[PDB]
Design a protein around this ligand. Sequence first.
Ligand SMILES: *[C@@H]1O[C@H](CO)[C@@H](O[C@@H]2O[C@H](CO)[C@@H](O)[C@H](O)[C@H]2NC(C)=O)[C@H](O)[C@H]1NC(C)=O
Lengths: 215, 200, 212
Amino acid sequence: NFMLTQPHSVSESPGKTVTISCTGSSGSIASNYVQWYQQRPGSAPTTVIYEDNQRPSGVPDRFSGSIDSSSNSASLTISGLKTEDEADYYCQSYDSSNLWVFGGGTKLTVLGQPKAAPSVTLFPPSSEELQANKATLVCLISDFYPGAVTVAWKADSSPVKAGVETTTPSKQSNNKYAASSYLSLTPEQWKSHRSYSCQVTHEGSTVEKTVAPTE
Amino acid sequence: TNLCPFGEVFNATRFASVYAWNRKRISNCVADYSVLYNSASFSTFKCYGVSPTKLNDLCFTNVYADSFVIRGDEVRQIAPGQTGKIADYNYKLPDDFTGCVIAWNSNNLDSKVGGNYNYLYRLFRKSNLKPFERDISTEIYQAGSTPCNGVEGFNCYFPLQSYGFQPTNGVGYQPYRVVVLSFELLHAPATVCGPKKSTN
Amino acid sequence: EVQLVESGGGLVQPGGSLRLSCAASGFTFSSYWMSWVRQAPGKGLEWVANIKQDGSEKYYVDSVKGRFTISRDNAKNSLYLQMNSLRAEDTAVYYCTRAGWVRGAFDIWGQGTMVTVSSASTKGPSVFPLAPSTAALGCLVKDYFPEPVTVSWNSGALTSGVHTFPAVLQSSGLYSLSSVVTVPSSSLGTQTYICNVNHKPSNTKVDKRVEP
Ligand SMILES: *[C@@H]1O[C@H](CO)[C@@H](O[C@@H]2O[C@H](CO)[C@@H](O)[C@H](O)[C@H]2NC(C)=O)[C@H](O)[C@H]1NC(C)=O
């Protein structure tokens, strides 16, 4: 039960320095070697850092691994950012109980434009679909940067684990991103509650939208 | 092809205590490091100053296999720049250390229902140990300004404490066996190499 | 020059079998450990299996333990993964990697091979209206398989405010998307606003009138 946990997304300017953390959950980071893998969308991963601070031949000086003896965590650091570095970065180590564990990954977005809050639109199930004994709420997110959000659903104040289906954000043609989240419901549950809520988190700021059956 | 005595150092019935840590010089042999990485059984395996993979194609004057026992949550202190009970008064490692640290859980061997107090560690010391220094002194730690004259009371503490290794202990309390390999490069015969053994 | 080439992926319905194969080149294959790392689409990396460089010890994840068998032919410079009794969660891209001792350093990554495990057959989608309250309406293209699908607006003429969102592979293994257009408030009531869906595999075309 030794998980590696790293944040979801970080961002910085064309030149800057940026640091991605990777903290062990149960077991000592620096009890074994910690690797870092770069992965641009659709491509295979490549190794930027092996054996704690070490970089393969070909990787620029900008990348630098390290290990914090205090927080039980390693950290990748990219001094003097370059837009080519925009990718997902996974950390990885080994443990005798859970062999070859991997991090969650972190999307490093090199900011080419100002950050932008997402425009969220939520639709209730249609009159037609309610006839069909099904009900789907459609939450539509667009025009946000960088490309990562977090979508949560609240049944009338309360969380909803089942039924939710959410797309991974994809680039529209202004270099911003857009995603959609669907709540697969039943007509019984839809008419039951006073309202359903779609809550989208993005770089701290959360945007909420809510609909009510009665009409 | 003299095969270096790693079977004797790692597979060893009795290990030392950390304040009184064992050492085993290694010379005049061919060192098959392949077994030590391909194992995967060890809980900690990190080397400092040299990548393990490129060790078969390496030669050294002497290898030093320090071997002792500490509790689970103390292996972090066997590393450069580390501090704590073990790294300061029992076994210190230098900043420019050049070698490997290997440890595995030994609660099935160094524990016993009731507690195996056989292994000790040092509680108090006048000051920190120099790198690779040993301290087997049983001198009563004078914790006041009044001397102790060789027996402990108030302001007087027998400096060696024990380890209550029980097989139900928490992992951070369970016993581990550490083997610290030290590599030496003197302007000297350099009589220890790995697989690439075409020079003799 | 190191390169790894995975083969033998594709589509298979649940409970079935499938055999992957990855071809090594440019390095001493008999001198490295070999591992499979998978990656569910839109999700992270997960290690799957590792095999010692003779084929003596094999290791896996508990997820696939008992169902996946790893092997290797050192002479033929090839690594294999016999995947039997597959599930939906096994859907991922399956990379083959060099690791090199046992403790890390997954040196090189092949380009991967796709493995899709879906019990879904080709089906045309149901279409539902979004019926707005600047307004925004659209259509809901539900439960079709496989991708792609096509959405025109107002028989192909309207193209100004349209935003066709990507689909989801829902729990049922059936895709579903929705496409919307923002329009003037005073454009409703006096505008047809039909949406035209074409699912080429299922060959079903559906035009849906969207009205407040
Ligand atoms: C400690 O002893 C074990 C066994 O007594 C050694 O291990 C074996 O290595 C051979 C290599 O040919 C394998 O075929 C066996 O399967 C291994 N057995 C076990 C139980 O691991 C081991 O190498 C010894 N330790 C050291 C450091 O030499």
